[PDB]
Write a protein that binds this ligand. Structure first.
Ligand code: 4WI
Ligand code: 4WI
Lengths: 305, 305
């Protein structure tokens, strides 16, 4: 028992982090087989970053302009290219610690772990959600770019995020590992704002099931609701609509606890309309929306990697 | 910017986890150089655990009764002994992934990361505090015993916790790596309860400094207070007394932000007496007490390992 925000073990990703320096700009890179992936703005000077022409900046660079360090070892760059907002540096050494991996593009509402790095070295690991407005609520400082987000499935690391920028509101934006941004953002230092965020309803419901599994049951009420009537209420409180697909992914938790999904929706509806009256759920006074249904099942059943 | 509950990168500890099986009981072990450390109740059957005589149970065991698996490799046990509540199994192979390490005993209020494991394999990592009542608010299931807690300082892993039991209230208790329990607990399945917990005042203050650093400043008031007058108020709200030692460890944050420690205490005192009026600090509606001053400085300055 107990329920914690839990990150994936980071070791498989730690063995892939390197430092990439171009000129005086140093950022983090991801070394998989004989390729280093990193954010393209490693080739920018401070003055270049307001309206960079990355293609032009890259034309002026040769392989040897990129200093790649893996621990105390310099990796020799033997090729380079740009794919959207990522640079790919081919090196003459394959990473012996490369895990089984794939590159995925995740959807809003899905969670992942971030290994925050500086100078190619890990600082810490935490769990995040891709928000419905395509931001993440991270913790990143200057030099963190190239830090990656990932999930693990048994032995396979699915990389889904590479960090690029911070928005004025303290939230973070980045790309998939093919260098395509999540959301309507561009890697230049110009005025950019995220759209209004919304609460990830299916994840709140998952967390209420986690609460039931841990014996925190006070919020269960005696009612049911229709999916339509629930969604009318959720809409007013800036909750995402609950779809049948969401209902289906809640199926395992619903079967395990014997609480129908639409019955949990009735209990959530009451929490939204009436509040919590100074009570907590799993120790929180606010409803939590950064656990997916899969996260809850994994944590409550002890799934390992 | 941004502030998250952050765990240490777990890879150094992942490379030390193994599975230990004795009879039909399987738990996790920590393999450092040529020694595996694990909880002694691996030698218990289900019936033994209500009033085990561990010395007697261990007399009947030979080296070969302990099956140690590191991945797909069986490690040959060549010696065994018991030190308080930990077994030490000498193996004929040194762990090639052993990090630089030490065993420490931490104090209440200090934080650490937990790598939760089952069958010798990692499930996830999260950050915890040793509570003032010597419990931790973890997430652990049957089979998690032998999972460890740790801090990292540059290249050195300080192991401070090994998991043994869950109390009826959903909280967790365990030992240091010399097998001595934190708190007045014993490893037998009998009625045991933790004392009343208390809020870790110096950590709340650290987190309010984190909030200021991130621009969440609304709670700063115009007043100061004496240490004595603060502690009278804290006492009523079940906050630990703030000592001069605590004031001193808050020094770096105080110097960085230019807010005197006793001035932050005046602001905390107002929050305790008046509440938060539906406002949040760093997104939380409750005051957070599981960041130490060192955690805040590390996260806000980008310290790496
Ligand atoms: C790379 N390490 C940093 C990481 C940022 C810095 C503070 N926290 C982070 O996560 N990335 C940048 O500095 C990028 C980089 C130039 C400007 N920039 C920004 O993050 C800026 N943001 C924006 O311009 C905005 F709002 F549009 F997103 C900054 C104002 C410095 C936070 C490039 C090329 C975009
Ligand atoms: C080892 N893997 C488990 C971990 C527990 C099980 C559920 N969550 C956990 O963290 N350890 C145990 O099962 C230990 C083990 C026998 C009994 N036990 C307990 O944790 C029990 N608790 C207590 O007896 C209490 F309250 F005294 F702490 C249990 C009731 C099963 C949770 C031994 C030898 C103590």
């Amino acid at each position: 028992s107990g329920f914690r925000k839990m990150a994936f073990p980071s070791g498989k990703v730690e063995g892939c982090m390197v430092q990439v320096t171009c000129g005086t700009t140093t950022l983090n890179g991801l070394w998989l087989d004989d390729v280093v992936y990193c954010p393209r703005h490693v080739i920018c000077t401070s003055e270049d970053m307001f309206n960079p022409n990355y293609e032009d900046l890259l034309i002026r660079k040769s392989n040897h302009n990129f200093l790649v360090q893996a621990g105390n070892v310099q990796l020799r760059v033997i090729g380079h290219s740009m794919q959207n907002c990522v640079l790919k540096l081919k090196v003459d050494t394959a990473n012996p610690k490369t895990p089984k991996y794939k590159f995925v593009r995740i959807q809003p509402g899905q969670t992942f772990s971030v290994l925050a790095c500086y100078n190619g070295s890990p600082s810490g690991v935490y769990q995040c959600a891709m928000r419905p407005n395509f931001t993440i609520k991270g913790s990143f400082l200057n030099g963190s770019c190239g830090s990656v987000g990932f999930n693990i499935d048994y032995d396979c690391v699915s990389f889904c995020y590479m960090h690029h920028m911070e928005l004025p509101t303290g939230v973070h934006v980045g790309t998939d590992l093919e260098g395509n941004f999540y959301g309507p953002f561009v890697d230049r230092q110009t005025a950019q704002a995220a759209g209004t965020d919304t609460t990830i309803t299916v994840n709140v419901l998952a967390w209420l099931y986690a609460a039931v599994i841990n014996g925190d049951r006070w919020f269960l009420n005696r009612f049911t609701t229709t999916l339509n009537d629930f969604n009318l209420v959720a809409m007013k409180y800036n909750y995402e609509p609950l779809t049948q697909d969401h209902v289906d992914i809640l199926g395992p938790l619903s079967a395990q606890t014997g609480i129908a999904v639409l019955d949990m929706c009735a209990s959530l509806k009451e929490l939204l309309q009436n509040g919590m009256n100074g009570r907590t759920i799993l120790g929180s006074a606010l409803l939590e929306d950064e656990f997916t249904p899969f996260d809850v099942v994994r944590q409550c059943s002890g799934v390992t990697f």
